[model samples]
Target: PFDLDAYLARIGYTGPRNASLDTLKALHFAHPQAIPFENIDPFLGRPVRLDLAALQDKIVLGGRGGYCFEHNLLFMHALKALGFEVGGLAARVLWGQSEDAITARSHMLLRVELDGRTYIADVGFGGLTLTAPLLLEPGREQKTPHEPFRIVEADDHFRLQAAIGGDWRSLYRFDLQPQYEVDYSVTNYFLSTSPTSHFLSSVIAARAAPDRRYALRGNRLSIHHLTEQTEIATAADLADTLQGLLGIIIPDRTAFEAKVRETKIVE
Candidate 1:
């Protein structure tokens, strides 16, 4: 069962909880801004779990963060418990890959119905989670806090794209087909275990606000604000930046500093 009270408390949400477009927007914004997107435990040798209790402990109580499965699953539980009608959906990410490159359906999105209108709510895409719910419409640009996102209709599928630097970039593609817990379990396992996957080998944290997106990829901290894009900083300099800008608190400060020695600065 979902602990709605704990979830709200963790996210610092004191707004109205009634099911409405406004509520979804508030919750979506607060969810990512509060819980964050990270892969800390997998690097610590502690596997990630999607169970409600595990989520409540790690994120709601422990003040930690996790990757997609953890974030989206926790959000789903909260929304369901709040009396919202939702359905699970999966996507294949094409964010940094080539157009011809093929990928698996490892990403998760949510289908929600509010006041007879259906909307797509996805708060799991690491580094670029949706800050606002987009109406299930094609060809319209959906404005978010950081960047404007749009869905392109492709045959029977929809391709999610983001407007970056005046150019539309494909982030991922998905359809209306709903997914189950098993689908995510398989993807999460591979993402957390496979040697070819970079999730366990590196530190990736991101948080997006109305004006900027704070990204800590390896040791280089890139703060994407109004006029700022890619500025490089060392691990020591990024210590305060991570906590202050991203709201991420490293459980063990000493261990976190030590882990910095293990991370290479991106040039």
Candidate 2:
């Protein structure tokens, strides 16, 4: 059975019982802003499990947050509990980098159907992705409070792009398919455990804002703003950067320092 009370309490969602599309958008933004996206546990030599009960107990109930699979899946659960029609969608991250096409299953997204119309609702895929539900259609630009966003159709896939300085860049791609929870479980395991997984092999953290985005990898932090149209960089101490920029508080500074030192060697 869907646990409405648990979902509300966990996400601190106090909107009207029958939330409209706008209410859902506000809920998505507020949740991510309040509880940040972090993968400190995986970086700290902890396992990432996909079990809903375990997730509720460890992350949600424990007053902590997590990365894509955990955050999006938990948010999906909450939507279902609230009697919303939600569907899981898989996305490929194309963040201005060359990567294998088959390796793109590392990302996830959601498609929410309301009143016979579909909307893209994603709380994951860190920086530059949607922080709220967007109308899922082609050739229409969404004038968000942050930036001008739009979704385009490409054969069997849907592409999300942001207009930045008269140029359109692909943020991510998704297909509106209902994915089984076990499918996500397999992907989550691969992301957290695989040696070649970027999450395990690199030191990166990212979060999105209304009009800007922030990312940290090692001792460098990058801020991309819609108005600026340029990425600003800063040299920062790794530990302090994680805490300040990523909102992560590493309990074992010594161990985390050691891991960061090791990452430098690999890079």
Candidate 3:
């Protein structure tokens, strides 16, 4: 039996309950804490598939973490199983300090309808994203456990922004259009396997806390707290950091070590 209840329990959510904004928020916290955001499979020469059953098998059964597609897809399923009107939306991530041209839809998120209002529920983005569901309204700042975030609407597209030094910057842009699962499958394949994609060439992970953000890129660990920044070298503790802090078990620790070493040289 394909037990959605067991799947929800695996993600640490006791559900089959009514869908509401608060429920969306609780689900985000429960799911991300249980299944972390990781990209270990691609590094191990294994193809990352997008089938719902395959994703459930890996995250729920195999006890593994995954990138955006797998994470958001599972989140969407959990919402649907709980009887929420959820839909998928694509986003382009503007990862810290990168002003490069946005090429493809490099992220996955969700829009859920509850009480005639739409909210954005995303658990895939590891760091600096919404820790809980956000109401899809413009010009209104919503407070999360981290910082105050707001959404701005421009014609057809919606932009998510965060306040930085009294100024707001675009974190990502998305629209209110429903997407098919197969559509995400294609995008996920490129992000996971493409040599030019950021996930392939760099070892990056992030998670947001109430007052600070933790980010690990290669051997550098950066903690950004409100108005303060701390960066420490993690050269000798990369393996333990990935395993213990991010809860990711890299299949080939030796190869990952070599990869991080090479990445540090370029930095």
Q: Highest lDDT: which candidate?
A: 1
Model 1 alpha-carbon drift over 4 Å, by segment: 98-100, 226-240, 252-267
lDDT (tens digit, per residue) of candidate 2 on 1-267: 445576666666677766478678876776665566767777766788867887787656676767888878887887777668988888887766755764466778888888998988877766554666789888898876556778999988888887776877778887876787889988888777777776775566666665576666545566767532222232236666767766665767887777766656123
- Highest TM-score among the candidates is held by which one? 1
lDDT of 2 at 159: 87
Give the per-residue lDDT digits (tens) of candidate 1, residues 76-192: 898998889998899888887544577877688889998888888888788577888888888999887668989889987899888888899988888988787788888888888
Which residue pairs does candidate 3 place in steric collision?
none
Cα lDDT of model 3 overall? 0.74
lDDT of 3 by residue, 156-224 (tens): 788888776677877888887678888898887888788877677766666555466666665566666
Q: Where in model 3 is the C-alpha error above 4 Å?
A: 97-100, 208-213, 224-236, 262-267
Cα deviation at 15, candidate 2, in Å, is 2.3
- Model 1 TM-score is 0.89
Report every candidate's CA lDDT: 0.79, 0.71, 0.74
Q: What is the lDDT of residue 103 in candidate 2?
A: 40
What TM-scores do the predictions have? 0.89, 0.86, 0.86
Model 3: number of backbone collisions? 0
Comparing 1 and 2 on TM-score, the stronger one: 1
